Amino acid sequence: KNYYQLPVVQSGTQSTASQGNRLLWVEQVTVPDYLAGNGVVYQTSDVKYVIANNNLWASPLDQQLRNTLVANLSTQLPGWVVASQPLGSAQDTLNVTVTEFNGRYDGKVIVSGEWLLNHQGQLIKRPFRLEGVQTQDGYDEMVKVLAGVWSQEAASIAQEIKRLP
Amino acid sequence: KNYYQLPVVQSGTQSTASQGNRLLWVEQVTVPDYLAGNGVVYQTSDVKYVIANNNLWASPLDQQLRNTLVANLSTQLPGWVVASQPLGSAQDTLNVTVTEFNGRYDGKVIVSGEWLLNHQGQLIKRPFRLEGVQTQDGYDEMVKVLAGVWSQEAASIAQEIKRLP
Amino acid sequence: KNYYQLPVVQSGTQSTASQGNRLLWVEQVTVPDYLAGNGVVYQTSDVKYVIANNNLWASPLDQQLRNTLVANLSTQLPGWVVASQPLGSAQDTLNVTVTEFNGRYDGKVIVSGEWLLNHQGQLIKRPFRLEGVQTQDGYDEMVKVLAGVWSQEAASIAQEIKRLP
Amino acid sequence: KNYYQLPVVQSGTQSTASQGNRLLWVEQVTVPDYLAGNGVVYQTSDVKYVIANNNLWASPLDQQLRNTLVANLSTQLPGWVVASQPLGSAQDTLNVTVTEFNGRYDGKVIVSGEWLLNHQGQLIKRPFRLEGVQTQDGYDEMVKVLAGVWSQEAASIAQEIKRLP
Amino acid sequence: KNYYQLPVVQSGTQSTASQGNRLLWVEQVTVPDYLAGNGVVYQTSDVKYVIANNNLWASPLDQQLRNTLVANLSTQLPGWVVASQPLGSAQDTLNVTVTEFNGRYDGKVIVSGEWLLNHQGQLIKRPFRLEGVQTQDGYDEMVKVLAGVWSQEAASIAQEIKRLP
Amino acid sequence: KNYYQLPVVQSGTQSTASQGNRLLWVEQVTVPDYLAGNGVVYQTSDVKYVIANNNLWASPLDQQLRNTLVANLSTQLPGWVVASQPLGSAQDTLNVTVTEFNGRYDGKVIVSGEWLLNHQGQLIKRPFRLEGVQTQDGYDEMVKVLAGVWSQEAASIAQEIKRLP
Amino acid sequence: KNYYQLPVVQSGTQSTASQGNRLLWVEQVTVPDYLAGNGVVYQTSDVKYVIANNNLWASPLDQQLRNTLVANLSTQLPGWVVASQPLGSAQDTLNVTVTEFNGRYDGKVIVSGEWLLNHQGQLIKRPFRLEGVQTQDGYDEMVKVLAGVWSQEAASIAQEIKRLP
Amino acid sequence: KNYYQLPVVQSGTQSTASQGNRLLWVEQVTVPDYLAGNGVVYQTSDVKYVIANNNLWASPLDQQLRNTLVANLSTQLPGWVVASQPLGSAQDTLNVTVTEFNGRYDGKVIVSGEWLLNHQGQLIKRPFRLEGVQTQDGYDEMVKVLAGVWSQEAASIAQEIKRLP
């Protein structure tokens, strides 16, 4: 048995308060049943996949993505309070649905999905596709590159958030 | 065991929804139990079909159709915001039913169904049938052609949407 | 294993709108437990039946009847919007209960049931019995003649609908 | 395994319900668990019965009784509208209970029960017992005679209905 | 296997109406778990009982008692409408709980319980104990004497009802 | 397997409840899981007990206690109406808890508990312990003595009730 | 098998009434899953425990603690009405959570937890740790010392209650 | 099978909550399924962990964390009242999430997470990571160090609380 968990990070000891508002609530990262299960997958063909047997998630993938996104956004938004729990009526909402989170026959690892943001009536939706390479052909390197690309797309979302005050 | 999933396309930097009218919600695409089952269907006679036991959907087919439809509509409606979740009050609703999504014994592939749309009170209903050809013997080519036909019908829905004031 | 599904049809590309109203909602085609199951049946005597073993429905019979009736009424009512989903408060309702959907010892295939329609307080109920013959003694021909007689009774209902503007 | 179902009779072109008063709803006919079970009962002594293990109802007996009652009442009440579903506000309600629906060791068949009806506030209650004779040794003849007695009691209910202003 | 059912009776063709009111609703005859089960019991000692193996109830004892009480009260109250279903707001209520329904080591068969009646605020409660003898030592005779004593206590309740207009 | 049940005593012609104040409702007597289990308990040491596997309650002990309490209270309160179901608005409530209902290794039997009563707003709380002696070796004698002690405590409750204005 | 139950006590025949108020409601004694189960435990190390196999609770530990606390508080608060059931709106509330209820490698038996009291807005919370010794190394003595220390902490709570009129 | 539980510390005579402002409620500490499982985790590589099958939590880890946090906060906030249950209206809320609570293959132990607090409308969010060293080979020492780090983080939360007016 081999279980993997996305390394969750933290933003030091900033202790951000809601005095300057800037609230953010993160809903559940919706994921289809071929990634939402406990099985790590590796694209072997154009539409054919392969579910791993003993290479599983430590906790379900959607919860991992939600918590790591909350951590990455809290790190990459200094002065913002981002939480996976409801904050208030003046909070801005974020809904993420992941479409791909696997490797590929060429040794590449793909992340992709869509994210929507509600800011006081203004809704902004955007899809994303990103790729990384494995230095060593292993599930360990696969999950690590997955986490790296997850951090990349979290940084993209943080930039898009900081763009509109 | 082999698993197949329809590739969910994605665009680049998308638009916002502060206009309100550029909103569309794709409710879950309903399919009958012979398509709702996790097995791939192969039409062998006029009313006879065969469900493959070792060739399955990676995730349930209805969720795949809903997600791929949302992605295609988000691509060919750049000024709009198409989502698989509710988006507002003046948001538009799109209810799609799929009656056939399988191949035939003559080496061909069929996709048929219906769809209803609500544009600010006006309800528009349209059925559709489409037929493609898989050129190489294999379920992978069948799934590829199926995804292509699904994208073609999403483009048809986009064209019908753009035909309104 | 041999699974059968009623061939669902379509009405081209009419794109009927609710501007001229003419809404129709189709409730679930209620069917007793000797036909509502997955087992095709063949009347062997006056009250004795025979449930088939490997001759089953692709999807449950009631859902098949509901969807095929929606399709047949959409085809046979040009200018009407017929759906298996609620349309509005000004919609007319239709409730169908099937009593027989099998073959007979003489090679005949029987369809029968009752249908009720609500049009703004005016309720119209009517029973129906119809028969067809099988050119070849086979379950394939049986299901095909069943679909043909289903289309026949759908045409009867469409005429009864078009009778009262 | 042999399955039996009561033949559901049907009339031709029936009437409408714009008058309101010509409305009747047959609630689900209740039978005890010795009749609610899917097995055919054979009364062997005064209080002793035997439930056939290989001779069963095609669908549960209570639903069959409700449907056959609705059909018979729709036949012998041409000016009325009898349905197994609610029909309006001024609609009439018919609650039927069946206490015996089986054959006896002397070669005879028994059908007994009670029924209550609500006519515009006036509640009318009447019990009934009827006995027929099966002439040929077989469960098929028993079911035939049972259906005939059920039709006779439906005719009795129709006569009691027609006796009101 | 030997199943027994309390013979339910009827009151001819009186067709009692609610014009003279006299409504009666019968609640579920509550019975403890040593009689409420499917097992006929036979008192072998002061507090020791014996549950029969193949001598069972055709339908659960409480439903049998409720239906037979409804029938006996409808027979023994000419001009009253007694039902196991709610009748109206002006109806009188009856609640019965049986404590014993078995035979005894001496060949005697005991029935006992308590019944409460609500008539427009006036509540009348009363316990009862009654005994019968078996002419032949058999479960058949046991159930038959049980039904006879049930009719006896039903007659007692009918007298107590007719006592207070 | 041997089953035991406490004999539920019964009186003759009882009284009515038009006075309102002569009303009492016995809520379900609660016992812990070592008494709530269907097995008879035998106290072997100070805190050690043994649950008989083949000597069981005919019906769950708590329901037996509630019914026997209602019967005894109906006997020793002739002017009152004690029931196991709600009786009105000015009705009185009696909540009894039983902590011990078993025999001891010295050949003796124990019954202990508490009870609360609501008399027109005044809440009265009283605990109780009682000890009897079984004279002949056998679980039957134990159950007999247990029922006797239960009747004694019901008489105590009756005496406390009669002590109020 | 060896089952143990905390000896519940009683306060004679005081028959305390609510005329002088002094109500007390006891909520469920919340207990973690290593003590809340049916398994008696014995601390073998600093953080290592040992769950007993055949040394179990007669009824679940939390119910036992709740009932014994109700009894001890009723004994040790003369003139108060303490119950495990709601008493009224003017009642004072008590919430207890136990953290330890086991023995130790040195033969010591530890009880510990926290209790909170609500008296008309004034909330008073307090933790407690207490120890006892076993004269004989046995589970019997263990449960007995547990009950003794439970009585001790009940006396402490009774003193804290009597401190504030 | 070996079970481990974090020792829940306890103080002496604590304070009251009549002031209202000295109130804190610790909602249930949430951990992912790799920590929510009853098994102890041992981090073997960067993203690889191993869950011990025979070394388990005595009770679920999340409940243990909540209880130990409440106890520590009750110790280092003498003037406050910290509870695991709601305490009032002006009460403060503390939502803690734990992302890591396990040891590493270099002989070290990690505890990381986040926590949010609501002080009279002001929401304060802070993450934390802490690392200890187990000196003797054994899961017992690991659990000891884990409890120590948890107490250290509770002290950090107490310090952040005391930093407010």
Residue numbers in the entry:
A (entry chain A), B (entry chain B), C (entry chain A), D (entry chain B), E (entry chain A), F (entry chain B), ...: 23 to 187
Quote the original article:
The E. coli Paraquat Inducible (Pqi) Pathway is a putative Gram-negative phospholipid transport system. The pathway comprises three components: an integral inner membrane protein (PqiA), a periplasmic spanning MCE family protein (PqiB) and an outer membrane lipoprotein (PqiC). Interactions between all complex components, including stoichiometry, remain uncharacterised; nevertheless, once assembled into their quaternary complex, the trio of Pqi proteins are anticipated to provide a continuous channel between the inner and outer membranes of diderms.
Initially, we overexpressed and purified a construct encoding the entire amino acid sequence of E. coli PqiC (residues 1–187) tagged with a hexa-histidine tag at the C-terminus, referred to as PqiC throughout. During purification, PqiC was observed to elute from size exclusion chromatography (SEC) at a volume similar to that of Aldolase (158 kDa) indicative of its assembly into a higher-order multimer. The structure, determined at a resolution of 3.2 Å, confirms E. coli PqiC as a mixed α/β protein with its two opposite faces comprising a three-stranded antiparallel β-sheet and two α-helices respectively. PISA revealed the interface to be stabilised by 12 intermolecular hydrogen bonds and a single intermolecular salt bridge between D68 and K166. The β1-β2 loop region was by far the most poorly resolved, presumably due to its inherent flexibility, thus there was often insufficient density for the explicit positioning of side chains throughout this region. We anticipate this arrangement to represent the PqiC biological assembly, which is consistent with its elution from size exclusion chromatography far earlier than one would expect for a monomeric species of ~20 kDa. Finally, the internal diameter of the pore formed by the octameric PqiC arrangement is ~40 Å and thus congruent with the width of the PqiB coiled-coil with which PqiC is anticipated to interact.
